[PDB]
Design a protein around this ligand. Structure first.
Ligand SMILES: *C(=O)/C(=C/c1ccc(N2CCOCC2)s1)NC(=O)c1cccs1
Ligand SMILES: *C(=O)/C(=C/c1ccc(N2CCOCC2)s1)NC(=O)c1cccs1
Lengths: 304, 304
């Protein structure tokens, strides 16, 4: 019993974190095999950040200008390249703690754990989701750049995010491990406003299923709805449209609880229309959307 | 920016988790130096659990009846003893991954990270608090017993909790690493009801300070209060009494924000009396109490 915002165990990723310094800028790097991945803005001064030409700035840098430190020992940089918004620093030593890994590009609504780091050292781990506007609501201070987001499937770490910046609004933007930003964000200190942060409907429904499995059932009503009727209500409340693919994904939770997906949609529609009335669901006074149907199944089943 | 329910990096604790089996019961153990710590109820059958005499049940067990497996390799048990509600299994091999560690007994209101494990393997990490009724609101399934709670200070892991049971109400109880239960709970399947789960006032105030530091200031009012007036309101809302020790502990957050502790108490008093009115603070519709003043300082400063 109980349902918590749970992150993956971070050990495998802690063994990959290094400090990268270029000139006066220090941030974090991810060391996998003989390559250290880090945000390309490590080459920028605070002034360069206003309008950087990364190709031009990188010409003034050599291998010896990138200082890579792994747990108080210096790594030798024998090559460097820019791939989109990340730098790949080839080092002469393969990371002995390299886990099995993949680089994945996630879709909005997908969750992942972040290992927040400073100066190559881990400070904490938390769970978040790729928002529908392609921002993440993290907890990052200056120097956290290069901290990564990941999911674990048994022994394989799928790296999906690398932190690059905080928007003027306090929300966060970054890239996949190929250096491509999620959303329309650029690594420049310029006017970048995020779009509507809509609620991830399929995740709210998954969390309502977790609530039923954990005994919190007060919100279950005597109604049902259709996908089209539910979506008229969802659009009005800034919830993402629910598709038949989402209904299919909720199948296992629907089967476990015996609650048809469309019945849970009708319960959620009434919660949107009536509010919580001062009540809570799984200790929350708002509808939680940073648990995917997969996270709910995983947590409720005890996947290790 | 941003404020997240952040757990400590779990790597150091992942390297200590083992599987302990006695007969048909399998749970988790913590391997530190040449000792494996686990709940003594590993010797119980589901029937024994109704009214166990642990001393008597332990007489029927020898070293070879405790099977300890660390990452698919078997450890040799060369001694066993019962200390309060934990068993200490002496093994012939010191854990090579033993971090610097301490065993601490925490007070209610204190937070810690839990590394939920099944069959000696980590499944997830989350942050929780020792409630004022000495329960924890975790996320534990059968087989999670022996999972531990901990805090990290740089390189020293202070182990403070070991999971032993779920109360009939779905909340959790366990011991410190000396085997002493937090609260009045016993490791027996009997009627054990928890006391009032009051709100940890000093932690709510700390989180309101985190909110101000992160730009969420709508709740700041033009009033102040006294400790005695605030506490009359706190008692009415099932909040723990605020003491001068708590005021002193909030000193650093009061200094950083320039908001006197008693002014923040008056803001909190108005939130209790008026409610949130459909508004949120740090993305929450309720007042969060599982962040200590130390956690707020740590997260807002980037301690690694
Ligand atoms: C790296 O750690 C880092 C990079 C940034 C690049 C641009 C930034 N912003 C700040 C807001 O105004 C526009 C430019 S930040 N910093 C950070 O990720 C953070 C700094 C403070 C909090 S998080
Ligand atoms: C160990 O993993 C474990 C021990 C328990 C001992 C007594 C328990 N209860 C269950 C509720 O009724 C009274 C007796 S549980 N189990 C657990 O921690 C859990 C089992 C289900 C969820 S957590």
């Amino acid at each position: 019993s109980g349902f918590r915002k749970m992150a993956f165990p971070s050990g495998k990723v802690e063994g990959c974190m290094v400090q990268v310094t270029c000139g006066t800028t220090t941030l974090n790097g991810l060391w996998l095999d003989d390559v250290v991945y880090c945000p390309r803005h490590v080459i920028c001064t605070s002034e360069d950040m206003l309008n950087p030409n990364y190709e031009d700035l990188l010409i003034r840098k050599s291998n010896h200008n990138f200082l890579v430190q792994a747990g108080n020992v210096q790594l030798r940089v024998i090559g460097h390249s820019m791939q989109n918004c990340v730098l790949k620093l080839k080092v002469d030593t393969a990371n002995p703690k390299t886990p099995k890994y993949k680089f994945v590009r996630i879709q909005p609504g997908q969750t992942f754990s972040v290992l927040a780091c400073y100066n190559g050292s881990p400070s904490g781990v938390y769970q978040c989701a790729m928002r529908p506007n392609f921002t993440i609501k993290g907890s990052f201070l200056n120097g956290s750049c290069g901290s990564v987001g990941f999911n674990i499937d048994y022994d394989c770490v799928s790296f999906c995010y690398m932190h690059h910046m905080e928007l003027p609004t306090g929300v966060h933007a970054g890239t996949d491990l190929e250096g491509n930003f999620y959303g329309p964000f650029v690594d420049r200190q310029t006017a970048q406003a995020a779009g509507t942060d809509t609620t991830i409907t399929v995740n709210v429904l998954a969390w309502l299923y977790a609530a039923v499995i954990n005994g919190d059932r007060w919100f279950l009503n005597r109604f049902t709805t259709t996908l089209n009727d539910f979506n008229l209500v969802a659009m009005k409340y800034n919830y993402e449209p629910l598709t038949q693919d989402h209904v299919d994904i909720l199948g296992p939770l629907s089967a476990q609880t015996g609650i048809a997906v469309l019945d849970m949609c009708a319960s959620l529609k009434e919660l949107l229309q009536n509010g919580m009335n001062g009540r809570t669901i799984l200790g929350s006074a708002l509808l939680e959307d940073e648990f995917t149907p997969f996270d709910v199944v995983r947590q409720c089943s005890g996947v290790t």
